[PDB]
Design a protein around this ligand. Structure first.
Ligand code: NAG
Ligand code: NAG
Ligand code: NAG
Ligand code: NAG
Ligand code: NAG
Ligand code: NAG
Ligand code: NAG
Ligand code: NAG
Lengths: 222, 339, 210
């Protein structure tokens, strides 16, 4: 009954290093190979390297060489993983794995339950709220909304008319742009006729930067 | 006559009754004297399959050498996890002798005469013997010493070359002499290898690898990490445990008054046991010049994994599991049954 | 050169349907499939192409047709939803997210386009927004065209989760340009294709017009 037991989750900052352990039981520690795999959401799961506890023999994946170290304590059946020079992109859940049988490394039947590592900066930016004005040209009804651009980190909440307007509202999942900031649009479909008479206020909140912003969306004057 | 089977083989070797040397004393009780006229029987239009990586002969030999070392090389202290045992550790005379493995009555051993055979798969030229050739049980890492040599061309062996977790065994055709010496700080030693011989052999190994990894650049680099036993070329000379820095042996790309490569070595008394889990402390070294003139007849390699731009394949010295050292010599043999 | 391509990215199915996930590979090597239920360690499903791991029901099957490996999941249950990865030695596929979908009538999208606010353009960046509202099924494609010229890698789609009340989806593709690239060109438009439209719907605007 093979068992891999990893250490708890950690939080780091860009530049620091981290160590994770993984204790094996149920089998002869030195007769089988261990691996470290990490899964960053939105990315391929990445094999980081393998370790043969017998001699401590190690094989690191090319992109991680220089930043990664794998050791093991043979007398307590525990593998270790160190990763230094951490950047934001090192945010992932890290796993130790072991093959189905000890002949073939790669059929990973056995996984620890993972160690979350969040690598984040304490810098926060407030969002720019731009209006998505309804066309003066006009299926059946009209659309309008807010463009919440360039904030960090998530989440941003958006409400309409202080929450009295909920029907027909869509707040889209945030997008992580190239800049490293998030962006989302919030929209709502309203009767095309009551456009110039009814007030429509976009209420955007962003707790990390203590920013409350109320934007009034209206069609341009010509 | 293929009938792959499991039997307890018996060892054979030419031990001396007078010799107090530890391999000799062990062989005196464990083994039998060598058959003066050993018979070989050829097999025409006979083709059979072998697997060097799954062979019971390797495990039998492994158990023997383990139990040899246990009786012969007594450490002052042996510490295991939390337990500890301390016995008398006198100095001993130490120099491996060739051991033959033989099939008992009813069984026999298949020899493969395909001199380009890579260890697995079908073999076209097959014969039958009762005993293997003389094998020196040399315990070492990174470099295979005092072994047999490939007789047609350099052979690369791996259970799967595309599998980066499988060890690569290079079987040389031309041997490279390595001389190690501790001169009479007294723990510092040094190895000497010719550049011409060594450079050339890695050039030649680069070329064979290029055929197995087309459109890739071949590059050698030093060991990635682990215990000193495997990050250095380690080996036992005359009872003493040597640990030699092999960085200079692996310096990148090998293209196509003599000048020598001096590898810096140390003699240690606190040693990790290759037999199993445990640290062993042996006696301080003896006095005088402690010298080994050995021959390098093979390498243990490990290929780098992970995504690669530049189209470059990188190889590093391996070792650690000694079963590998034995299969480098037992690859051409399989134990069969008669019927 | 990873050369282990998994597709499709997202698979929206119902319970009882069957999931068909694929993986191309030119390389020699054994292939395995893993399943990651939300918030859990991945688990081995198929190894060596078609061999089911232990505890894995007959509903899961693997096949191989040249370089093309397939993972077929029949009689889809709720415990089967998650992300699936193919693996060959040290490499993994991008992942395929199979997620629940509720069946309903096909509904064409309502399309709206939004020019960048002038308040924004004082910042040197232009954000055009195309909104596809309340459609079904989920599969939809938005293409940007600036003066009859298709755009490459300068837009980002964003999809809401299927609505609990009317089972529809909503998509938001945002095209971003520097103010400079926006000062040039007159016409901006998004071209929407869907299962509920006989022919693509395009909504446009001339720059500076109202
Ligand atoms: C054995 O020799 C044959 C030629 O007689 C050669 O073609 C073959 O490749 C060599 N054996 C193997 C399996 O490598
Ligand atoms: C098998 O073939 C080789 C040629 O590759 C030949 O020289 C040899 O005599 C044969 N094996 C033996 C030793 O009978
Ligand atoms: C040996 O190989 C090295 C590779 O680094 C090279 O620089 C050197 O010229 C070679 N020396 C010779 C020719 O013995
Ligand atoms: C091995 O020798 C090389 C020579 O360049 C040196 O860099 C390295 O530190 C040595 N290994 C150790 C850790 O002694
Ligand atoms: C090793 O490589 C360096 C270049 O990186 C070269 O200058 C040097 O000559 C090489 N050393 C040997 C073994 O000749
Ligand atoms: C040897 O290797 C070097 C590495 O850059 C390369 O520039 C050179 O062309 C090679 N020479 C050959 C292929 O003979
Ligand atoms: C290799 O063999 C020679 C004698 O042939 C011996 O002097 C030397 O000690 C051996 N090397 C080792 C490490 O056994
Ligand atoms: C080599 O690896 C493949 C999978 O890539 C495996 O199916 C096969 O058994 C291996 N071949 C040998 C010689 O064992």
């Amino acid at each position: 009954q093979v068992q891999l037991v990893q250490s708890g989750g950690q939080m780091k900052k860009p530049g620091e290093s981290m160590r994770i352990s993984c204790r094996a039981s149920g089998y002869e520690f030195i007769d089988c190979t261990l691996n470290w795999i990490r899964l960053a959401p939105g990315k391929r799961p990445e094999w980081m390297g393998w370790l043969k506890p017998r001699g401590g023999a190690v094989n690191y994946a090319r992109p991680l060489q220089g930043r990664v170290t794998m050791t093991r304590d043979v007398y307590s059946d525990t593998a270790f993983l160190e990763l230094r020079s951490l950047t934001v992109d090192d945010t992932a859940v890290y796993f130790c794995t072991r093959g189905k049988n000890c002949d073939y490394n790669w059929d990973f039947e056995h996984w620890g339950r993972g160690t979350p590592v969040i690598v984040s900066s304490p810098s926060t930016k407030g969002p720019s709220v731009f209006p998505l004005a309804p066309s003066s040209k006009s299926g059946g009804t009209a659309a309008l909304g807010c463009l919440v651009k360039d904030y960090f980190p998530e989440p941003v909440t958006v409400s309409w008319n202080s929450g009295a307007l909920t029907s027909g509202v869509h707040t889209f999942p945030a997008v992580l742009q190239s800049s490293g900031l998030y962006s989302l649009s919030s929209v709502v479909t309203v009767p095309s006729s009551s456009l110039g008479t009814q007030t429509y206020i976009c209420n955007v909140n962003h707790k990390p930067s203590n920013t409350k912003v109320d934007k009034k969306v209206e069609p341009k004057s010509c | 006559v293929w009938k792959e089977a499991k039997t307890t083989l018996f060892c054979a070797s030419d031990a001396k009754a007078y010799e107090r040397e530890v391999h000799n004393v062990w062989a005196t009780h464990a083994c039998v004297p060598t058959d003066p006229n050993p018979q070989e029987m050829a097999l025409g239009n006979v083709t059979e399959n072998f697997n060097m990586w799954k062979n019971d002969m390797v495990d039998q030999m492994h158990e023997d050498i383990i139990s040899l070392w246990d009786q012969s090389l007594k450490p002052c202290v042996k510490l295991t996890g939390g337990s500890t045992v301390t016995q008398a550790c006198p100095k001993v005379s130490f120099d491996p002798i060739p051991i033959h493995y033989c099939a008992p009555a009813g069984y026999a051993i298949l020899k493969c005469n395909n001199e380009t055979f890579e260890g697995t798969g079908p073999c076209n030229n097959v014969s039958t013997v009762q005993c293997t050739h003389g094998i020196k049980p040399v315990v070492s890492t990174q470099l295979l010493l005092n072994g047999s040599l490939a007789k047609e061309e350099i052979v690369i062996r791996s259970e799967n070359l595309t599998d980066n977790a499988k060890t690569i065994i290079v079987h040389l055709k031309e041997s490279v002499e390595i001389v190690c010496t501790r001169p009479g700080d007294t723990r510092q030693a040094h190895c000497n290898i010719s550049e011409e011989k060594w450079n050339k052999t890695l050039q030649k190994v680069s070329k064979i690898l290029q055929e197995h990894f087309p459109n890739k650049a071949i590059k050698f680099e030093p060991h990635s990490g682990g215990d000193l036993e495997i990050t250095t070329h380690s080996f036992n000379c005359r009872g003493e445990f040597f640990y030699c820095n092999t960085t200079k042996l692996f310096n990148g790309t090998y293209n196509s008054s003599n000048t020598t490569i001096t590898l810096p070595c140390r003699i240690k008394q606190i040693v990790n046991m290759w037999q199993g889990v445990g640290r062993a402390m042996y006696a301080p070294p003896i006095k005088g010049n402690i010298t080994c003139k050995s021959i390098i007849t093979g390498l243990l390699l490990t290929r780098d994994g992970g995504n690669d731009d530049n189209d470059t394949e990188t190889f590093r010295p391996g070792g650690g599991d000694m079963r590998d050292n034995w299969r480098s010599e037992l690859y051409k043999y399989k134990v069969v049954e008669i019927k | 050169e990873i050369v282990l391509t998994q597709s499709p990215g997202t698979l929206s199915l119902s319970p009882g349907e069957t999931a068909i996930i694929s993986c191309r590979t030119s390389q020699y090597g054994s292939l395995a499939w893993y399943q990651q239920r939300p918030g859990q360690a991945p688990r081995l499903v198929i190894y060596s192409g078609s061999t089911r791991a232990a505890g894995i029901p007959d509903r899961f099957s693997g096949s191989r047709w040249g370089p093309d490996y397939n993972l077929t999941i029949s009689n889809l249950e709720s415990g089967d939803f998650g992300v699936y990865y193919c693996q060959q030695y040290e490499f993994f596929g991008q992942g395929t997210k199979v997620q629940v979908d509720i069946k309903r009538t096909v509904a064409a999208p309502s399309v709206f386009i939004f020019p960048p606010s002038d308040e924004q353009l004082k910042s040197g960046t232009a954000s055009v927004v195309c909104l596809l509202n309340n459609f079904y099924p989920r599969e939809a494609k938005v293409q940007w065209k600036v003066d009859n010229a298709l755009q490459s890698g300068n837009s980002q789609e964003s999809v809401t989760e299927q609505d609990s009340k009317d089972s529809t989806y909503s998509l938001s593709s945002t095209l971003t340009l520097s103010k400079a690239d926006y000062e040039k060109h007159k016409v901006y438009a998004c071209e929407v294709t869907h299962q509920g439209l006989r022919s693509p719907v395009t909504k446009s605007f001339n720059r500076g017009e109202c």
